[PDB]
């Protein structure tokens, strides 16, 4: 501790006093994972290898729920030329539990799949398939020349009277009035039918042959998480600091049996600070209070290195029963004073610990800790007919020092 | 008719437990002391709008209300949601229903045309009034359709007040959170009729409102403040407290809002020669790139943007769509 004090002050000699050198925190003993006991795997195969994909203007919609969704197998597959995610890491999907995982499928002309991304502008993005600028999910695309190519049954929308909202679909087929004059019934002057086919002939070069696109969109921690990743649940430990994972909710703290009466629909709890402090275990459905396991500053009580290299260490606001988990013992109200012996005699304060306790170097010579004495006890001899009059005096010159100015930096 | 919804229609906005805290949630809530239309369906059922949400209440004596119909067209041309609670099982179902003009339940109503959802389970609407005797259950419901979920909240309480809703507080709790994703604009109740003539309840509409919800030590919402109801509530909302001490508090900022929009552009009529730019017979060599100033124009950039002739159209400092409204 003394060397840690010297490094904190960046000096080799430290004067008498109490110095905060570092912070104590209990470290997690082990790891806990508690995912819901979902009883079935997920049908990603039915989406990715589907006999017929939909047109971009009529993109398919599959709602995925109650899954053990292993995304690692999808990522490790070599077929997917494009696999990029905008709110999550592809390699970190398999340890997050999500809700209403929507899997949309459609065919795109080719290299314009890049328009399938937040904030993109173009024919596909504006009028065919728009996804929000704050999109969280993954866009998956691969070449399908030997599956969709000639062929004309895949269509896309040229024109729309306004940009589509995120995840909006348009099935209307009324004629778009491109010009500033009325048009009805047929493609007149400056007036077109809004759709036509891609024309996926096999002769199309790279960047124009058909590309099948599958985009997964995710919602997390808004509800009982359903499309949970494959991570296996572990046992549940209580009253020991431990880092946990409840349905993707990661954290660190000590779990304890809770007296909180969660209503059936409630899965989490929160404090006045809006910080999570309770969680319903998804397996046993019991409520567990999450308390942050003990932390606090460490203060080194040292006399002048001139006097002695012996020091005492104070773990501020920390109980003695759990300090040796990190690394004389005396339980002060400010924390555990280690290395200083408690003495019943009360002297004047030398090194203030706090809450009326002070420490000092006394003598066979060691650091003592005591309750500070306020002053010499005095019972003045008051009486209703007694007066004390000084018979002599003393002239005392007491020096007083006051700052006046400081350096004129600029 | 019409009646006062004093403090009804409040619900648990989320699945988070909170105790002994005043939380300022902003969500589709029924405004305090709002006017809720009172329908005497039995001496009919009109098709009512579904603006943002619907606070539905009823105090029927023998459970005649058995569910609701939701949708936009309600004629099999678009997907529609059906909730009808039979004696032993609720059926929550989204198909392309061919609804009858006067839906009702016999003593039976369903469809299967191009259907895309079904959830048959235990019923939440049952004949509970017989046990209460004269006291009548007040069944309350709140429907919402946001973020692709059809959210239903509910709460049933014993009351004796006849003509109007109770002067009390009770927070509605969720029933279901259905991943549905359809467009809902109209709805109507369906009733159980013994005599099948194939020819009572209050309705209020939610609005975006900030509510200061008070959670007691047990975690239930016991009282709330509608922050936009009146200046006193706004003061209580700003201080995040339900009682305010004597004083003067700044609560919000008043701002006169503009009545209409005014556009004043120069009196220029000639259309601008982009045709000479793009339809030039010969383009210049890149080392001798052309430089044609364009001034005194009425330039229409939409035809340039929406034209399929351009394989690349990216604008850096301006948005391609907003070029028309901008003056350069």
């Amino acid at each position, epitope marked *: 501790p003394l060397s840690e004090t010297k490094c904190t002050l960046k000096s080799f000699t430290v004067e008498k006093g109490i110095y905060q050198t570092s912070n104590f925190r209990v470290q997690p003993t082990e790891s806990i994972v508690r995912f819901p006991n979902i009883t079935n795997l997920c049908p990603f195969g039915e989406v990715f290898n589907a006999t017929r994909f939909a047109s971009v203007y009529a993109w398919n919609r599959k709602r995925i729920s109650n899954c053990v969704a292993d995304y690692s197998v999808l990522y490790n597959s070599a077929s997917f030329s494009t696999f990029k995610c905008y709110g999550v890491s592809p390699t970190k999907l398999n340890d997050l539990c999500f809700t209403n995982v929507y899997a949309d499928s459609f065919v795109i002309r080719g290299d314009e799949v890049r328009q399938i991304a937040p904030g993109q502008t173009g024919k596909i993005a504006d009028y065919n398939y728009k996804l929000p600028d704050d999109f969280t999910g993954c866009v998956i695309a691969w070449n399908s020349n030997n599956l969709d190519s000639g062929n004309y049954n895949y269509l896309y929308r040229l024109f729309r009277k306004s940009n589509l909202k995120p995840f909006e679909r348009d099935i209307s087929t009324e004629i778009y009035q491109a010009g500033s004059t009325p048009c009805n019934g047929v493609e007149g002057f400056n007036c077109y039918f809004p759709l036509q086919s891609y024309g996926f002939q096999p002769t199309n070069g790279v960047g124009y042959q058909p590309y099948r696109v599958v985009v997964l969109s995710f919602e997390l921690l808004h509800a009982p998480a359903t499309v949970c990743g494959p991570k296996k649940s572990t046992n549940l430990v209580k009253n020991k600091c431990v880092n946990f994972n409840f349905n993707g909710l990661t954290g660190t703290g000590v779990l304890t049996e809770s007296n909180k009466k969660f209503l059936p*629909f409630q899965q989490f709890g929160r404090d006045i600070a809006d910080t999570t402090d309770a969680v319903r275990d998804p397996q046993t*459905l019991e409520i567990l209070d999450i308390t942050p396991c003990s932390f606090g500053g460490v203060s080194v009580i040292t006399p002048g290195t001139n006097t002695s290299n012996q020091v005492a260490v104070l773990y501020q606001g920390v109980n003695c029963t759990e300090v040796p988990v990190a690394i004389n013992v005396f339980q002060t109200r400010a924390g555990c004073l280690i290395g200083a012996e408690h003495v019943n005699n009360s002297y004047e304060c030398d090194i203030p610990i706090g809450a009326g306790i002070c420490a000092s170097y006394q003598t066979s010579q060691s650091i003592i800790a005591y309750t500070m004495s306020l002053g010499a006890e005095n019972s003045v001899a008051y009486s209703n007919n007694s007066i004390a009059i000084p018979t002599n005096f003393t002239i005392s010159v007491t020096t007083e020092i006051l700052p006046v100015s400081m350096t004129k930096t600029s | 008719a019409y009646t006062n919804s004093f403090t009804r229609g409040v619900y648990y906005p989320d699945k988070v437990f909170r105790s002994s805290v005043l939380h300022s949630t902003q969500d589709l809530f029924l405004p305090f002391f709002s006017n809720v239309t009172w329908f005497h369906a039995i001496h009919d059922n009109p098709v009512l709008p579904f603006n943002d949400g619907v606070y539905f209440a009823s105090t029927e004596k023998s459970n005649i209300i058995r569910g609701w119909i939701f949708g936009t067209t309600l004629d099999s041309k678009t997907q529609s949601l059906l909730i009808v609670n039979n004696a032993t099982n609720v059926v929550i179902k989204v198909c392309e229903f061919q609804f009858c003009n006067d839906p009702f339940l016999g003593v039976v109503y369903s469809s299967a045309n191009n259907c895309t959802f079904e*959830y048959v389970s235990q019923p*939440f609407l049952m004949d509970l009034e017989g046990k209460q005797g004269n006291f009548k259950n007040l069944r309350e419901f709140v429907f919402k359709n946001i973020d692709g979920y059809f959210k239903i909240y509910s709460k049933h309480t014993p009351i004796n007040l006849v003509r109007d809703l109770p002067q009390g507080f009770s927070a509605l709790e969720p029933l279901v*959170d259905l991943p549905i994703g359809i467009n809902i604009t109209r709805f109507q109740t369906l009733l159980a009729l013994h005599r099948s003539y194939l020819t009572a309840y209050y309705v209020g509409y939610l609005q975006p409102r900030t509510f200061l919800l008070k959670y007691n030590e047990n975690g239930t919402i016991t009282d709330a403040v509608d922050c936009a109801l009146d200046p006193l509530s706004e003061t209580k909302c700003t201080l995040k407290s339900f009682t305010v001490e004597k004083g003067i508090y700044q609560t919000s900022n008043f701002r006169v809002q503009p009545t209409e929009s005014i556009v004043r552009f120069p009196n220029i009529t000639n259309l601008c020669p982009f045709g000479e730019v793009f339809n030039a017979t010969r383009f210049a060599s890149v080392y001798a790139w052309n430089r044609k100033r364009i001034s005194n124009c009425v330039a229409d950039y939409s035809v340039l943007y929406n034209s399929a002739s351009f394989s690349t159209f990216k604008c850096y400092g301006v948005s391609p769509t907003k070029l028309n409204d901008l003056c350069f």
Partner: antibody
Amino acid sequence: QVQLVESGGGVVQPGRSLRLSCAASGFTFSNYGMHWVRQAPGKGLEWVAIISFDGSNRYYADSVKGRFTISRDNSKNTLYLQMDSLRAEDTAVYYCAKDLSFYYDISTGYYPQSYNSGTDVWGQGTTVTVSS
Amino acid sequence: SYELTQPPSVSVSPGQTASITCSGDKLGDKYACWYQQKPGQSPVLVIYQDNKRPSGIPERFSGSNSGNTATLTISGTQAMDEADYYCQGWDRSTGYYVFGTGTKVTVL
């Protein structure tokens, strides 16, 4: 098949303790509140205790309140009844009964808030006798 | 204390109606359920919500509840109906699930 099977019956002395265990299969155990019911030999049924779908709320009969303790472990689909300070009157075959109506469907979040009163499925039963 | 009183036994000729009655001071406010128990077998639910049969029970079973009495009835009693019938006062809010004294229906 929806079934319930009990275990842990036997002979016990007065003042000792015993624990019953009812195992559940064929249905989502975590959704349904569960009962314990006992029947003394040649007598009628007597309700012992009930436990909520998550264990938050438990109720006991006056004949067993303070002595018995009901519990469940939804991750094992098992129901427990800790018995302490057994007496002669506790001699009875103990049944575990499923509620006809589930309190909350964890799979979909369905919270009916209005439930039928029946207990459709009962266990086979395990005998417990108390004597010196 | 709560004592859902039922007659010890009721005698019925085969093919004749049998009215099995259960009584309680506040049973009208509460729901009543009936369980059939052949000897050596666990109870089987026959009536819940005072008139509702679970799937698979014969339609000839019926019940009612009003005032201080809840009454189960069988339109036609067969030889297999000889059993012990127990009423139960059900109330989730009050945590009240006490069974009745039971009634051995006698077929002779």
